[PDB]
From Swiss-Prot:
This protein's encoding gene: bla
Protein name from the UniProt record: Beta-lactamase TEM
SUPFAM superfamilies, per the entry: beta-lactamase/transpeptidase-like
Species this chain originates from: Escherichia coli
Gene Ontology molecular-function annotations: beta-lactamase activity
Coiled coil: none
Broad class of enzyme this protein falls into: hydrolase
Disulfide bonds: 52-98
């Protein structure tokens, strides 16, 4: 609805930065609403959903197993790794790593998983092969959250991320079991409370993944809908603001509120 666009533009004035927005119909793939759909924004942690999408693909092809245990040392530990710091002695299974990367945004878990699939270059090739010729991962954690102005590294476009998310969750790329596993991890996300979740009515379904980086970068991707069933995909990104975390969180939640109101 155009009223939501008013809110997106209002967010731009408040944050004094660009805000990319896309609202997509999960079933047909129709773009319902868009704002700066083809401009680039740094993905930040939102790429982790794509990463685990690629990991599940390999699991479907029998090249990987969810139960395989991966051992690492404290030399592998990077900034912000709540789950991996604690499982240093035991190591973690591929399944536990993806859960950690998506639900807790564990940075080391992302890096470990990146190594198993061939790194940034392979994730990018994976995306290209499924029809996404725009989204690209170039670096590892935490450098990929740098968000240098005009840098095309580690970026996506709102429309690309939206359509790619749709393919992973409802397309024939992954098996039913894997598509369900990916959406389950997203539904269990524990660090996206101030965002879309704070403006969601009771009983609604939501599977999301947020991101935060340098230079006021913030973002979130989500599949949501009433009656416990997802029916739309929303992607929101912003970068360049001097605003605090709370202020950026507030704007995204307000966009979510408008999105719900005019559903
Ligand atoms: P994800 O939750 O987006 C991983 N993000 C990340 O590592 O952010 C670190 C950061 C944020 C802000 C300034 C400097 C570094």
């Amino acid at each position: 609805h155009p009223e939501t666009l008013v809110k997106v533009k209002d967010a731009e004035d408040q944050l004094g930065a660009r805000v990319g927005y896309i609202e997509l119909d999960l079933n047909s793939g129709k773009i319902l609403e868009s704002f700066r759909p083809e401009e680039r924004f740094p993905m930040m942690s939102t790429f982790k959903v794509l990463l685990c999408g690629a990991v599940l693909s390999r699991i479907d092809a029998g090249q990987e197993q969810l139960g395989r245990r991966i051992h690492y040392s404290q030399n592998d530990l990077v900034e912000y790794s709540p789950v991996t710091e604690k499982h240093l002695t035991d190591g973690m299974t591929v399944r536990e790593l993806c859960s950690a990367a998506i639900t807790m945004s564990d940075n080391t878990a992302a890096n470990l998983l990146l190594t198993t699939i061939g790194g940034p270059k392979e994730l990018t090739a994976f995306l290209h092969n499924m029809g996404d010729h725009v989204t690209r991962l170039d670096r590892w954690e935490p450098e990929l959250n740098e968000a240098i102005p005009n840098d095309e590294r580690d970026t996506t476009m709102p429309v690309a991320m939206a359509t790619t998310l749709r393919k992973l969750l409802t397309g024939e790329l992954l098996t039913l079991a894997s598509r369900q596993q990916l959406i389950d991890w997203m539904e269990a996300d524990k660090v996206a409370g101030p965002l879309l979740r704070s403006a969601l009515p009771a009983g609604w379904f939501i599977a999301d993944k947020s991101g935060a980086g340098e230079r006021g970068s913030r973002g979130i991707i989500a599949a949501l809908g009433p009656d416990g069933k997802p029916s739309r995909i929303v992607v929101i990104y912003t970068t360049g603001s001097q605003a605090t975390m709370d202020e950026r969180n507030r704007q995204i939640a307000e966009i979510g509120a408008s999105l719900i109101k005019h559903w």
